[PDB]
Amino acid sequence: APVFTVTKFDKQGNVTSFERKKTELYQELGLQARDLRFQHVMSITVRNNRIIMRMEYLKAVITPECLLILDYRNLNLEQWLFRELPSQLSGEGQLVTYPLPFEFRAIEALLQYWINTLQGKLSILQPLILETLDALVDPKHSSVDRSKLHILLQNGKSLSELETDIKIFKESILEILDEEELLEELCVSKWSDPQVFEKSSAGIDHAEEMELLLENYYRLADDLSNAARELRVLIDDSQSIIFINLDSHRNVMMRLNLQLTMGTFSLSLFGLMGVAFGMNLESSLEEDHRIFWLITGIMFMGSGLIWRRLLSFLGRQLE
Amino acid sequence: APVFTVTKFDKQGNVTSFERKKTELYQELGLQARDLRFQHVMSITVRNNRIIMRMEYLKAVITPECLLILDYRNLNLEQWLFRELPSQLSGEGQLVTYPLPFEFRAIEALLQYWINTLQGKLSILQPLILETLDALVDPKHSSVDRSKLHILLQNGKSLSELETDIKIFKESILEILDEEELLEELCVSKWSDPQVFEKSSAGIDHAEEMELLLENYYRLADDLSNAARELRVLIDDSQSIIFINLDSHRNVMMRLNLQLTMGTFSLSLFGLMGVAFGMNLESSLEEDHRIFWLITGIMFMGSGLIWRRLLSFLGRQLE
Amino acid sequence: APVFTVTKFDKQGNVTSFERKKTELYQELGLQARDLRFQHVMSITVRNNRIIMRMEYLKAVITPECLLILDYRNLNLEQWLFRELPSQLSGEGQLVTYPLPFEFRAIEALLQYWINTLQGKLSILQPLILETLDALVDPKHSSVDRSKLHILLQNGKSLSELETDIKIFKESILEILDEEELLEELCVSKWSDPQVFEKSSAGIDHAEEMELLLENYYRLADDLSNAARELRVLIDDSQSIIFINLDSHRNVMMRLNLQLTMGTFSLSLFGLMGVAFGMNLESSLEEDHRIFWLITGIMFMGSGLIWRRLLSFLGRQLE
Amino acid sequence: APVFTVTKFDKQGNVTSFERKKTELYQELGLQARDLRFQHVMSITVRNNRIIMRMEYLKAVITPECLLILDYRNLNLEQWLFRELPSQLSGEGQLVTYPLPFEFRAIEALLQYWINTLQGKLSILQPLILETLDALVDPKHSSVDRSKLHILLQNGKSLSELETDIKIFKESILEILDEEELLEELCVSKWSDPQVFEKSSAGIDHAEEMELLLENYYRLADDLSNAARELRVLIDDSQSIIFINLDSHRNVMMRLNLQLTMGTFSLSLFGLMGVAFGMNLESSLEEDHRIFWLITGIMFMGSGLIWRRLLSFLGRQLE
Amino acid sequence: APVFTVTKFDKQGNVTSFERKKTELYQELGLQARDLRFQHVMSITVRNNRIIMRMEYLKAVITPECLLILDYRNLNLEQWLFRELPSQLSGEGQLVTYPLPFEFRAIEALLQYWINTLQGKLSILQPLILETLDALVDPKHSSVDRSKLHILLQNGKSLSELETDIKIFKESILEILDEEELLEELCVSKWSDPQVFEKSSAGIDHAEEMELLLENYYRLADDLSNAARELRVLIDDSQSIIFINLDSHRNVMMRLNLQLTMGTFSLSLFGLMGVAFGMNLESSLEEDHRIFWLITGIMFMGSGLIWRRLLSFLGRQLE
Ligand SMILES: [Cl-]
Ligand SMILES: [Mg+2]
Ligand SMILES: [Mg+2]
Ligand SMILES: [Mg+2]
Ligand SMILES: [Mg+2]
Ligand SMILES: [Mg+2]
Ligand SMILES: [Mg+2]
Ligand SMILES: [Mg+2]
Ligand SMILES: [Mg+2]
Ligand SMILES: [Mg+2]
Ligand SMILES: [Mg+2]
Ligand SMILES: [Mg+2]
Ligand SMILES: [Mg+2]
């Protein structure tokens, strides 16, 4: 029989970790089997007055009386759970929903944890990508470091995954915010005992508070998405600049090679003249003395003149 | 007369395969000819209290009493139909709509099959594309394997087709979910005998259950679309990295070729000097003895010095 | 005075072709001059209980009693009109709106013709583009065929035009479908004599039938748009693969040229040694016999060793 | 004191050009200072029953009795104003709003002028861009004409500006059309004396006529936007084809250079053999006669054989 | 205890700068701690009849009686605050909301300052980017200046950041404008003493004035966004033109190098002939006199002929 590893935080912040059979959990929470399938990444739903949330590896069930974290093992959640959550829920944590019922504090804690995780991913990726791009777009490098290219590719893949996570988080929060029915449903304590809260709520609107909390987290996620999109745009612009730099270096090297090739061609032409005039054959110019110096002088001078003329021709061709 | 190859599953899960004339099928189902044209890929409609669904090659008609699969031959559907569907509909299948009427189970089975097909396509494409990209973006390869390029092109075309299929599936599900009239129409058993279901429905809302089922499948398809889009983005980034790697290797090879060309040019210049000074002509320096060693020494030393000067010039040019 | 070449199909399918002055046509149809300007490509409007449709070169006016096609000459419409339209309207055509009034049949015929035209354009473009891309992305070609590149460019321009046509058709159909007022207006026979159709309509809803017809054609156009977009994406991916193939071939050729340049450089260095040691000058090593063989042997061996060392250096540089 | 150069057209089409202080204009029109700031490009608003329109350099105020054009000098508007506008408003112009009040004619004239301006810009840009692209994508050119590249860049910038203008025009017209309140406000003559027009309007709806006019101009602008987007897509496709053509020409030239380099390498190897065997040193093979012919024959034959072997090696490498 | 550096402007324009503990500020403004967290860039909200605005570094709280600027130090805001704001609020400033209550003037001043900041950023970036692109796309440059490339990259990053800022400003203004509840909430003076303003408002609608002000600033931001997008499109087009120019220069240089390589190959072939015929070996053609001139003449003529034939071959290959 499948089981859930459940960490339960009550309204008093006490932590109880145990394992419970899935059928027993369904019976306790008043939920069906399909409700706790957790097959969707980044899904927030309300079933039978219970808030089922899944943010990647974080699966949570919020009740009017307690919070349950499921399948928390082997995820490095022990520090976060057993240090922050008791303090955030029933201590001096940074949560600003203390006068509000427990579900507001639980939702705020979960959304704050996910926002902090996304912010940490972005704040790890951004300096690495920035320094890699700065190293790569250096104008004085003829060629780029390919190990840094592999690092940039891995970081870009991580950035795309992070951007997708931010996008789906924003989509879920926005689709919850758009409909007032979902906002009303999220107030589980209000609907658990509506008769009690008809007079308990001394002019305070739970739906308004939930809307404000979700809007705050949506705005934070929107800022994260804008930063990630800016980073992606910077990556693309840096890649274009790298392409232009490599092409410019190629053109410079090609121009130098062409000039040297013109020089070599002129030298080879007059070397052909010299070797043709210096083969082991009887001629009528061996007796003359000035002929050797005249030939070598005209060879060198013509090589220089042809090289200069070819350089001028290249300059005219390239304008 | 055109005919349909019909596989019928009753509410008890019994399977009956036969062939029926199209007019007879229209008369039996209370449908017109235009309803069963099946000319749209990924279309879900409700006509005369019958649910007509088409997911590419899968054409189905859901009635309050039975499910019909049409044109199922030569599509490798025999295994799925004759093994899963009886168990899913009237057995111990994974469907979570057993207390719900038959149309809920049929819709769940069809949507689950299509989602599984898309997931299988994605899970086949993803490892192949990942390994091909990993092989191609290897920084230590001067040139890429073009057979792997052809494989990557074919897999990218398949990925684009899969992404289009996921997109149209999401569009159909979302356009059904947006309007409450369509959700009400999908509950064919409710509207077949409204008087009976006015009291049969003991506080259970069929429209709500249909909305939950369609939302679950829409979220699954959204996850699939996000994964496919991430794969496409990774393909594009890998292609950019491949371009940068190839350009960097070209620049390195060009720099080496330019250095060797400078060396060859210096050697050719002083070889021109030597061949000019070594032609079969009478000169005034054959008698001298130190002249030969002086000439060869200055030739070699000048070749080296000119090569070093040209190397420094290249270094200055490339900064 | 400007005139219209009018082809009129009555409810009985009879065809009458003539020419009529524009003012006379306005008086007959009960329309103003601005209604029949036909200045918008792909526009469907209802003015004075008349349906004015324009699909590029096809201008039509649908009345409760007749259909008019205007400016049909020099457009290869004679075959379509004078063969299909009588059969589709008042024969055994594939139209599924025979029990419906005449305007439904006319709208179905026009939309079917336009959908068939778009499908024919796509089915002509797709095999040509596919075969051109298959020829171009061949991995064993060092260079691509530029005539095929020109053909691909022309076909891509045609594909973009077709995609724009499909997009505007979808936009017009969707904007008609979104508002129920437009759907009600399209039923010209219903509003021509509302008193008669108040009892003539035996439980059949004209607006619902019009909505179904327009939805069917919108779905067909959506499938066409998806196919065209897939073709464009395939074109872009093939272009990227062509770029990678060309760069890889360039890198391979550059590596071969660099190896041959290293060999030539070593040969030229030791040829400089030989020519320097073989100039017409008196030396102290002409008397020796083993010196010639020693010099040539060390020249060849050193050329080989330097070539191998430079090859190893290139291998180290390219990793 | 700032002043406006005002050209006023009455309902009778008479033209009066003058200059008026801004405060006097505000008092006459019953408008505040902020209404006539004209700080937004392509803005259509209704303030105090006056229609304030700005289309780039064209600033207009439409009153129930007159039309005012402001800051018309030094804009080449004299021809358009003083030739078209009197005829369009109170003559035989192409306006189709003569039975409608004056504001309909004024709005039609202004929108027609702006649409004509955009159409003229597009009809000037399109042939130039088309001919430049046709010249540039010529497959038989090894290199492209860079002056034509500069012309294409300037025309592309102009096309982007025109596309932005069309987009903002469409946005303004669509945002006016979406809300019925704005359509009602645009009928300034209706709201100037509502008691009079309560009986003056003999069954004619001013809001409907305004909606039809704005829809017509929106459709014209949509056609313009589609044409401009098609032109941009064609520019991008042509640039890609140019890239492929240049890379293919580079590959062809590189293959030729590599073949010639292989030939030169073989010739240089056997030239090294010859020069080593032809240095001024005493050897044991000068006496023999057949040795010279044997050496030269084997040199030439080996050069040819090595060249052919290297050509085959290149063919194998490039497949 | 954390404190705020508060600059307060009353309705009379008087400026008072001080520091106040955060709890004291919360008590004075009737706000909770979470309201003044200022964790969202570009957020406009209304809490407890107070307008909380944050535009990057500018944090402001608008009350019906006063305006507060928080954390204004070390931001170069002293000039703007202490020179413009007193004049804009209670002087001869350009604000057009003097008859309106104080909150209208404060909102107008803040939005005007942010719009001016964005306009200044755009007007600084645009000339720099334009001149850099004009320098880079010069057709007569074989290679581009890489320092200008780095400058262009930095300016493009700044432009992307500015475009993101404009986008978020537009999004906030538009989401405020879409809902009438937010527009009503922004009129803090109206809701502070509704009984007084029930008769104080002599036919003037505060919500309408707020909507007009926000629409004006939204249109200004839309113009800014259009200009920034045009600049980005121009940057991309210029980069494409730079790529084409570099490739064309590469092709020209490669063609010249190939022609010179063909010439060098022909010269080297006939130099091989000469050196083979001029080695120190006994032959049967030393006695002849015309043989030397015949050999050198045929060598030169054949070199020329082979060079011309290879040039023709290249011309045929490149078409
Ligand atoms: Cl290249
Ligand atoms: Mg992921
Ligand atoms: Mg909201
Ligand atoms: Mg497909
Ligand atoms: Mg929903
Ligand atoms: Mg000699
Ligand atoms: Mg067209
Ligand atoms: Mg509908
Ligand atoms: Mg390239
Ligand atoms: Mg402009
Ligand atoms: Mg409308
Ligand atoms: Mg920023
Ligand atoms: Mg509004």
Numbering used by the authors:
A (entry chain E), B (entry chain A), C (entry chain B), D (entry chain C), E (entry chain D): 83 to 401
Which text from the study accompanies this structure?
The overall structure of the hMrs2 channel has a cone shape, and it is assembled into a pentamer with a central pore in the middle. The pentameric hMrs2 structure can be further separated into two parts: the N-terminal funnel domain within the matrix and the C-terminal transmembrane domain in the inner mitochondrial membrane.
In the hMrs2-Mg structure, four Mg2+-binding sites and one Cl−-binding site were identified. The second Mg2+-binding site (called Mg-2) is located in the pentameric center of the matrix part of the hMrs2 channel, positioned immediately below the inner leaflet of the membrane. The third Mg2+-binding site (called Mg-3) is located in the middle high region of the hMrs2 matrix part within the interface between two adjacent protomers. Mg2+ is coordinated by three carboxylic acid residues (E138, E243 and D247) in one protomer and one carboxylic acid group of residue E312 in another protomer. The fourth Mg2+-binding site (called Mg-4) is located in the near bottom region of hMrs2 within the interface between two protomers. Mg2+ is coordinated at this site by two carboxylic acid residues (E297 and E293) in one protomer and one carboxylic acid group of residue E261 in another protomer.
